[PDB]
Amino acid sequence: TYTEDFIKKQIEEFNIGKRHLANMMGEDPETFTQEDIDRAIAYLFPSGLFEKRARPVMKHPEQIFPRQRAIQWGEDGRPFHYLFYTGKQSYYSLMHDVYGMLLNLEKHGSRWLIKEELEEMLVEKLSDLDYMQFIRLLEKLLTSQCGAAEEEFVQRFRRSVTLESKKQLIEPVQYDEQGMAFSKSEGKRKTAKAEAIVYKHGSGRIKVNGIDYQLYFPITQDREQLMFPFHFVDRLGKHDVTCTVSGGGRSAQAGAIRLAMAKALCSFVTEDEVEWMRQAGLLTTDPRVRER
Amino acid sequence: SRYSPEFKDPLIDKEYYRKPVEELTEEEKYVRELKKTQLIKAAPAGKTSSVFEDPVISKFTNMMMIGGNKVLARSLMIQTLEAVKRKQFEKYHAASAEEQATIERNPYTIFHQALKNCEPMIGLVPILKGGRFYQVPVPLPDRRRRFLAMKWMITECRDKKHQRTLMPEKLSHKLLEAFHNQGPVIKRKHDLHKMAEANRALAHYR
Amino acid sequence: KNWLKKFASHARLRALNGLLYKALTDLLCTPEVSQELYDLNVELSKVSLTPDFSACRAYWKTTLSAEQNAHMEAVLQRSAAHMRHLLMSQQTLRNVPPIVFVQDKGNAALAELDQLLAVADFGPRD
Amino acid sequence: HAPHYIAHRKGWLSLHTGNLDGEDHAAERTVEDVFLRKFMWGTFPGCLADQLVLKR
Numbered sequence: 082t083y084t085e086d087f088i089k090k091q092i093e094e095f096n097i098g099k100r101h102l103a104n105m106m107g108e109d110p111e112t113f114t115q116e117d118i119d120r121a122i123a124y125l126f127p128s129g130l131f132e133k134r135a136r137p138v139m140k141h142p143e144q145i146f147p148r149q150r151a152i153q154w155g156e157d158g159r160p161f162h163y164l165f166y167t168g169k170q171s172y173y174s175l176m177h178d179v180y181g182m183l184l185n186l187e188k189h190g191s192r193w194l195i196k197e198e199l200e201e202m203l204v205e206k207l208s209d210l211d212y213m214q215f216i217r218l219l220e221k222l223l224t225s226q227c228g229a230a231e232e233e234f235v236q237r238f239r240r241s242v243t244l245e246s247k248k249q250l251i252e253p254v255q256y257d258e259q260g261m262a263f264s265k266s267e268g269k270r271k272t273a274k275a276e277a278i279v280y281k282h283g284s285g286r287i288k289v290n291g292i293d294y295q296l297y298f299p300i301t302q303d304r305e306q307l308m309f310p311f312h313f314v315d316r317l318g319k320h321d322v323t324c325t326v327s328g329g330g331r332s333a334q335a336g337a338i339r340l341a342m343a344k345a346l347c348s349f350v351t352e353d354e355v356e357w358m359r360q361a362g363l364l365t366t367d368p369r370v371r372e373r
Numbered sequence: 374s375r376y377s378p379e380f381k382d383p384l385i386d387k388e389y390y391r392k393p394v395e396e397l398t399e400e401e402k403y404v405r406e407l408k409k410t411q412l413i414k415a416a417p418a419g420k421t422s423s424v425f426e427d428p429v430i431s432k433f434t435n436m437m438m439i440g441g442n443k444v445l446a447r448s449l450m451i452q453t454l455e456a457v458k459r460k461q462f463e464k465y466h467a468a469s470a471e472e473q474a475t476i477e478r479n480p481y482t483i484f485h486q487a488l489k490n491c492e493p494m495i496g497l498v499p500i501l502k503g504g505r506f507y508q509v510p511v512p513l514p515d516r517r518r519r520f521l522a523m524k525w526m527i528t529e530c531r532d533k534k535h536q537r538t539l540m541p542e543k544l545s546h547k548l549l550e551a552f553h554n555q556g557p558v559i560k561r562k563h564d565l566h567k568m569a570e571a572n573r574a575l576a577h578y579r
Numbered sequence: 580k581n582w583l584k585k586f587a588s589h590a591r592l593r594a595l596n597g598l599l600y601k602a603l604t605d606l607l608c609t610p611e612v613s614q615e616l617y618d619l620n621v622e623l624s625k626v627s628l629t630p631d632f633s634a635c636r637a638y639w640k641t642t643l644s645a646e647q648n649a650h651m652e653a654v655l656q657r658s659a660a661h662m663r664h665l666l667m668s669q670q671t672l673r674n675v676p677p678i679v680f681v682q683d684k685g686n687a688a689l690a691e692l693d694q695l696l697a698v699a700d701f702g703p704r705d
Numbered sequence: 706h707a708p709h710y711i712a713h714r715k716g717w718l719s720l721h722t723g724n725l726d727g728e729d730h731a732a733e734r735t736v737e738d739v740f741l742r743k744f745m746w747g748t749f750p751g752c753l754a755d756q757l758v759l760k761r
Contacts, residue, residue, distance in 0.1 A: 128716075135714040190410075247409050300444055302418070309421045313387055332418055340415075357390040360408055362383030362416030368375045494699045495692070512695045563702035570701070576692045577685060 083146055091142035098139065115141070151204070171203040172211065179218045182234065186225045190244030193219070199238075249355050249364050252348045254281070264348035268340030270367055273329025277341035281349055283321025285311075289338065290325055303335035310343040310363055314354050320346070340366065380412045387422040429485060433523055452541035454480040457548060477552075487551040491522040491558045495569045502578065509579045510569040525558050526551070592628055595672070600626040602671045603637055603662065603678075611665065612658050619651050624683045628676070635676050638683040643690075648682070655680040719759040734761070 099118065103110035106121045118139050126137040138145070153170075154160045162170040164177070194202070196212045223235055252264045262281040267274070287307060289297040298304050311317045322342055326334045343363040347355050358364050397405065420426060430450060438446040461478040468476055477483055496517070497508045513521070530543045550556030603623055610617040624638045639655060641648050659678040666675045706715050719738050723731035738759055745757055 130716070131713045244410070246412055302443070302447070305421050305423060306418065308423065309416075313422045336418060356409060360383065360390070360413055361385055361422075362413050365383075365413055365415040367415035367417075370375070495695050510692055512691055560702070563700065563705070566699050566701050567705060570696060573692060573696065576688050579685075579688050 088142055088146060091146070095139075095142055102139070169205055169207065169211075171205045172207050172215070175203065176215060176218065179215075179222060182231055183218070183222055183225070186222075186227065186231070189226070190242065191239045192242045194238040194240060198240075247356070249344075249347060249359050251355065252345060254348055264345045266341050266344035266347075268337045268344060268366070270336035270340065271329050271333040271370055273326060273333035273337040275324055275326040275334065275337035275341040277322055277324040277338060277345045279342060279345035279349070280321040280323075283319065285318040285320070287322040287324070298331070298335060300331060303331060306332075306335040306339045307342070310339055310346055310358070313358060313361055313363060314346070314350050316346070316350070320349070336367065340364070376414055377412075380414045381408070383413050383416045385416060385420050385422055427481060429488065430481070433484075433488075433527075436523055436527055449540050449544070453544045453548070454484070456541050456545035457483055460545060460549065483552050484548060487548045488519075488522045488526070490551050490554055491525060491562055492518040493521055493562050493565050494518065495566060496521070497565070497569055497572075498579070500578070507575055507578060508568075508572060509575045510572055511576075511579065522558075525561055529556075529558050529561075589630070592630070596626045596628055598671065599628070599635060599637075599666075599675070602666055602669075606662055606665060612661050613654075616654055616658050619654060621651060621655060624686065632674075632676055634679050636679045636681050638681050640686050641682050641684070643687075652680070652682070718756050719761075721759075721761040 099113060100110045102118060102121050103113040105125070106117075108117060108121075122137055122139045128136045130136055153162070153165060160166070162174070164170040164173050167173050193216055196207070196209065199212060199215070200207055219235060219238060222231065227235065252266055254262050254264055256262055263278050264281075265276065265278050267276045269275070287294040294307055295304065298307065308317070311320065322345075324338050324341060326338050328334075329337065340363075343358055347358065347364065350358070355364075394402075419431065420428070434443070434446045434450045437449060457480040458478065461476060461480070461483070465473055465476045465478055493513060495510055496513045498511050500507050500509050526544075526547060530540065530547055535543050547556060547558065551558055600623065603626060606612060607616070607621050607623065622640045624640050627636045627638070628634075629636070639651070642651070659680060663675050663678050666672060711717070719734075721734050722728045723734040741759055742757055746753065
């Protein structure tokens with residue numbers, strides 16, 4: 082067990098060690114920060130162990146050692162919080178606040194906070210059912226015409242899961258020396274790697290490694306594959322393509338080219354068509370590869 | 374599988390997306406909105422938005438394939454279609470004025486109708502309960518009979534009594550016989566529907 | 580008897596099976612149990628008594644619809660106890676074990692097979 | 706820690722260039738390591754609290 086005197090001595094030792102490390106690395110001890118400590122300890126004690134926690138670490142004793150309870154009452158004996166005797170002062174204080182916000186309104190891409198990190202925020206163990214009750218209150222608050230402060234309060238209890246699955250990244254339109262607008266993109270299928278350049282205006286001329294596509298791809302199926310992206314958005318005969326592919330085989334090269342042309346063509350179609358191409362599987366790298 | 378459970382299979386249908394927002398119902402609107410969040414698998418080599426795509430012929434080609442040789446399988450399928458088309462044109466030019474209205478020259482129509490004429494409606498299931506195997510009848514799912522038509526056609530065309538007749542010519546002849554409700558495959562369907570009628574009492578065992 | 584507290588608080592087997600089959604069919608023939616049960620027209624296939632006489636399983640023929648099957652099952656399960664009471668009150672049997680209604684899935688097979696065989700194609704003149 | 710943690714949590718007791726791609730004399734260094742470990746364990750009996758670290 083770690084007595085408070087032990088933690089105090091550890092804090093003093095860490096401060097002196099921080100000043101020593103700043104002396105060693107030539108940096109000013111005053112502005113020396115934890116990122117600087119991490120960089121310096123990575124330089125001085127190089128360790129490529131895969132486990133980041135098995136590497137040398139110089140952290141504040143507060144961070145590295147566990148924590149303890151807080152005092153809930155002073156020497157007079159009176160608890161600080163008015164909901165102390167419930168035994169769940171933090172949770173019920175939060176519920177009380179939410180109910181007051183709902184009363185005020187009644188007078189007038191992301192994920193819900195999960196139970197364990199709610200416990201961390203409240204610093205109180207709570208059951209499943211009371212977690213559900215809190216989440217139902219939060220949902221009820223969201224449904225109402227919540228204001229700015231209310232939306233911030235709700236944002237306190239919602240982390241991110243990312244909404245970018247909606248949106249594929251659109252390449253920027255570049256200009257060649259002739260003044261023709263084009264867009265470049267890359268794709269990969271098995272070991273085949275392709276880079277395509279799609280010109281805004283064209284007549285459907287596709288050049289693979291400086292060769293016409295029907296001569297590079299004798300098999301009809303590969304030409305079907307190259308046709309798929311433009312055909313999907315009804316833009317056959319409206320672009321010129323200059324692609325370079327390397328590695329893989331016949332079908333892997335065809336698929337890599339198809340992905341590269343789809344990603345490059347994303348620049349010249351509407352956002353709705355970008356989403357449609359995404360839902361058709363035309364913008365997703367195929368990860369299926371040979372297993373060991 | 375290298376795809377996680379989140380990934381969903383893509384929808385290659387080109388006319389689905391062009392459907393107007395006005396025609397969308399609330400349910401279909403919700404499905405469309407939901408799909409936006411979801412991760413989609415890369416479309417596989419094969420199906421395409423091409424207007425000539427035929428899933429039935431693609432499956433037949435995949436079932437003729439041996440050892441991953443899809444180029445040869447597709448070559449055989451296209452040769453079979455060409456042979457069917459040429460035989461129908463030959464039969465059409467030698468026909469009277471009135472007989473030319475009832476000669477089909479579209480090979481895809483003939484192929485689909487031939488595979489429809491070979492589908493068994495009912496089948497048999499080996500079930501040994503009393504120490505003796507009992508073949509009980511069962512009605513087949515649509516997928517099962519659709520598969521059985523193709524499997525019987527391919528097995529019939531691979532039979533070794535057909536000696537040095539190349540695959541496209543055998544397959545076209547079998548398809549044109551099955552188009553007119555003739556040939557050994559229609560007989561195999563009938564002799565299954567008869568062995569499933571001669572055991573209509575064993576159904577209760579199921 | 581102070582009922583308020585109580586409420587608040589093998590050849591022989593085949594003969595009994597046949598007797599209970601006839602009795603349960605004749606009970607289902609009328610609104611004696613309830614009008615809702617009568618309107619359903621529930622048909623029984625057989626009656627099977629467990630070898631220790633702890634339960635009487637009455638197998639009722641299911642229909643093709645699913646919502647009808649669920650409604651029939653609900654009504655039958657709700658009416659089992661009253662049927663047991665009537666069977667003992669009419670003295671068809673002195674003691675009747677609890678009645679369990681079990682769907683029969685051996686009839687749908689023959690129905691669907693006849694449906695398929697009535698439109699299937701057979702060989703020339705065969 | 707078990708042998709399958711040798712590059713994850715543990716390190717290597719001996720360090721030299723022999724086992725690198727293109728280098729030579731791996732076997733010589735290994736035999737030297739074995740003799741060094743036996744010699745030290747016999748010359749410091751009951752003193753060594755942990756394994757030796759042979760650096761080159």
